[PDB]
Amino acid sequence: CTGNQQSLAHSRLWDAVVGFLHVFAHMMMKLAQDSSQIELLKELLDLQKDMVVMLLSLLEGNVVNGMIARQMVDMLVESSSNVEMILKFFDMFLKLKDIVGSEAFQDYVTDPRGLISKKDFQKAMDSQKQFTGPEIQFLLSCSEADENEMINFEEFANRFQEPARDIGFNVAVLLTNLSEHVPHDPRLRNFLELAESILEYFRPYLGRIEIMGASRRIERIYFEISETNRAQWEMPQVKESKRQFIFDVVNEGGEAEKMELFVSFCEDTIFEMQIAAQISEGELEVQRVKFLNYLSRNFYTLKYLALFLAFAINFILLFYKVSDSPPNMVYYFLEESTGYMEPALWCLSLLHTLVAFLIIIGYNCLKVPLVIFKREKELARKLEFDGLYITEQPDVKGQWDRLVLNTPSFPSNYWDKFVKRKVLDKHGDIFGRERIAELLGMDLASLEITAHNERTWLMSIDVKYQIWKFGVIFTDNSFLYSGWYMVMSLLGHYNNFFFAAHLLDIAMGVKTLRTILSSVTHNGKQLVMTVGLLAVVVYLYTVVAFNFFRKFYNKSEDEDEPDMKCDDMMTCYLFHMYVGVRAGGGIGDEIEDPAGDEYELYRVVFDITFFFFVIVILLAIIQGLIIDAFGELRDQQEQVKEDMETKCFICGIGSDYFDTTPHGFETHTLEEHNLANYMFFLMYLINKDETEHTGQESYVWKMYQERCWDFFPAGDCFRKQYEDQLS
Amino acid sequence: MVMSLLGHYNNFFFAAHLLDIAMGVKTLRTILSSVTHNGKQLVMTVGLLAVVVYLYTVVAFNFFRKFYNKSEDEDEPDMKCDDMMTCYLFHMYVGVRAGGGIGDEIEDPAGDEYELYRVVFDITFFFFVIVILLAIIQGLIIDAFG
Amino acid sequence: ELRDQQEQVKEDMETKCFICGIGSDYFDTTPHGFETHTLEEHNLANYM
Amino acid sequence: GQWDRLVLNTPSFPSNYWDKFVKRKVLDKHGDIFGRERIAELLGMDLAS
Ligand SMILES: Cc1cc(C(F)(C(F)(F)F)C(F)(F)F)ccc1NC(=O)c1cccc(I)c1C(=O)NC(C)(C)CS(C)(=O)=O
Ligand SMILES: Cc1cc(C(F)(C(F)(F)F)C(F)(F)F)ccc1NC(=O)c1cccc(I)c1C(=O)NC(C)(C)CS(C)(=O)=O
Ligand SMILES: Nc1ncnc2c1ncn2[C@@H]1O[C@H](COP(=O)(O)OP(=O)(O)OP(=O)(O)O)[C@@H](O)[C@H]1O
């Protein structure tokens, strides 16, 4: 609201702030000289944290060159000599941790207790040339004396770091906000170099983002990112979902759902991260949980020991021979005279059947939730928004899903556990409350009569919900492939040739191969037709042979024994389709010459036409289709890599508009619109309270809690509105 | 230099310098870099050929050993498909080069015993290998040239 | 080629208006801009 | 890189790269931050002398 931000811009509020600036720079530098003064100083840092966030919330709704920004900067330079004293206090107490991490001063202490001598550590700071002369006696006075041989550099590093943590980040926000807001202020240029160390210690934990709300203006929004949110973001199990999410959105997804899939992806990744935090490192439950944690943690590598074994049980098997007298036919092993192979074969079989099971359990305990999360989310959301069932009517998927609504735990992974009430209330009467409570199993009256508002897993394991979950998982594809790998492994103990069907998983995983495997199924609906066309053409050329050319079809040399393959038309047709399309010269290559004048010319056309139509055209098209489907699937993976280096993926502005300066597009992508920044912003919003969301924060949040996507830039990024007014 | 020097050992080595015409002559040097341009995705295709011919060797070693008698002599039986390490080499040697698939080099399935199954074995070995993969490869090669 | 003539159609019908020769970019400066434009401004069904 | 980490001690590291004073430059610019004497030992400069 401007009407308050105008009145605050015209009082003596700056002159109030200047007095608060002068008391802050002098209270700390007096209070930093005792251990028994530290209780007071933590309160002071939390106070000026709340002061500068008032300055930030005063500087929201800010234009690039506005007088509020200009009254902010001269007030900082009317309060110069103290505001560097607070800046140098942040600057000295941050390099103190980075200096003491060097081994040059751990070598300067020879005490095994760690109690470094004061004058010894005094010349240590005098050895490095970054601090000043008065700084070390300021630091020696900050240190404890303890018979002048003990400063205890370890506790001295982190003592004044954790209470000074958020405020040192927060002051860097305001400095980098205003410097990004107004250009050409050399006092700010004096300020930014004076506070360089607090920038780089608080640049990775910072994140920038740019949203456009509040009557068509984009503005830089800033936030904190924890160490924990960046730790479980740079995991490959999270990253593999992203690389797929990059693919199927820019390839087949339109510009509309791009953002809707993005926040859905932001929902799903946030999920996997919760369940990865769940598994991060009488007692039957405890032992089993340790077992599961061990499994899932190794899960990525337990697949490699399954691949090895399987490539070994083969090199062994590749040594079978057959004979009558078993040293009827008795399959046995060559016995190459190495370590007894049979024994090792049995051992590896066992293993390959165990290390499969423990590949199934891992999948069940890792990738299941994120699927029974994707289903629950999508369902509930297409329920309380589109009113799928109560108003409209369904898709085998939908019919199957119309089974858990009665369940007492419908939202079992979808965080929102109140999606029951919402739908009822929003269609309360329109479709009959009691009817809706019956459909959803809420128990209406008693439900709302729940005392909550007013005032042994096997033991109670709901059956019906388990049935729904198993149905949906068995409907999954990747679980079916792991079920097939288990079933083949198990069946292998029946006959080791089945340990030659795991041998085959090298293929379905090895990238360049997996493409060649999807080629067939990519357009089978238009390759099966071609095969069928081959079947019908060979049919038509079989019928004529069965009406006029039966005479020639005698593939038996024996004078007496006549074969006459072309008598039972079901036999002639198979003869053609078996040795016809494989002759390479057509059918006429496998029958007697037409030298006989009888129908000689007609057969001379039958041969040539069968060859040309089939073995030159169709046995070509097919190959054609195949090779092609292999080429296109090698381009869909190309266009992505192309455009991700050409478009911003948030706004549809190419790289040319950001090529009018070095690293223009690069910098734009790297800080203006890193989508990682957006996904972090979503987590930061979800984490903090509601009573603390600032204006723009609460605004974007409340436009998210009802699924409106008008707060993404999509058309201009802070260099099309203010391009002229900023250099 | 090493080939030239070794040539004095046996003049056929003066047929390895003969080959430098190639590595310098532009239009050729391209054809030579084609193979190494994407070998990481052509070696995989070869390997896929190896594995498919393997899978079609195993079935022949479990049900079709009977047919694999490439020796005409009445007495002397060859039976190439007895030592699986022998049957697999027989396939990978005269299989992918038949141009009509493996079924072009064995006795006819006229015998009703497993006649239909062999009529599918032949056609599938031909289609999957000699029409698809021995095509892709050529494909990869020609492309890398384009 | 006969598999591309059927491609270009599906491409451009999602790129041009078919009544005015204005692409989808000019109607991309707002959500569903091109979509709304096609759906009410120029549904040729409306003309017929 | 590992192989290149062999000539830094050599008395003639910049043998074709015209700049033959690239020894001093690096020392001076990281003079203390990483220990002069340590850097002179790494680069075979013989610091003081
Ligand atoms: C380890 C491995 C390496 C290679 C390499 F080719 C590559 F280059 F790709 F890495 C090689 F390293 F060998 F060179 C190929 C496949 C595997 N196999 C598995 O990961 C594995 C093992 C057992 C059970 C299952 I399930 C799997 C497994 O995850 N399979 C699939 C096919 C990837 C599962 S899916 C159908 O994609 O969901
Ligand atoms: C003279 C010549 C002509 C032709 C013509 F084909 C062309 F049209 F290209 F000019 C021809 F004139 F014959 F038509 C082709 C190759 C040569 N060979 C050499 O230059 C030669 C000789 C000996 C040792 C070496 I080393 C070379 C030589 O430089 N080789 C390479 C292969 C170019 C060296 S590299 C691997 O490229 O570094
Ligand atoms: N808004 C964006 N516009 C264009 N490209 C983007 C955008 N956001 C991220 N990227 C892309 O993300 C990539 C970041 O580099 P990086 O290699 O780390 O990611 P990756 O190639 O997908 O694989 P990974 O990060 O897992 O190693 C860059 O290619 C960068 O272009």
Ligand SMILES: Nc1ncnc2c1ncn2[C@@H]1O[C@H](COP(=O)(O)OP(=O)(O)OP(=O)(O)O)[C@@H](O)[C@H]1O
């Ligand atoms: N003026 C127009 N510009 C671009 N596209 C148009 C225009 N008018 C109609 N269309 C196209 O007509 C299609 C309407 O969707 P719809 O699927 O119903 O038609 P269809 O795909 O041709 O087949 P059918 O309507 O018979 O089911 C949209 O793809 C829409 O882009």
Ligand SMILES: Cn1c(=O)c2c(ncn2C)n(C)c1=O
């Ligand atoms: C896991 N999770 C989310 O993913 C989420 C949320 N609110 C919004 N989202 C996206 N809550 C409360 C939540 O617990």
Ligand SMILES: [Ca+2]
């Ligand atoms: Ca508030």
Ligand SMILES: [Zn+2]
């Ligand atoms: Zn952008």
Ligand SMILES: [Zn+2]
């Ligand atoms: Zn129009």
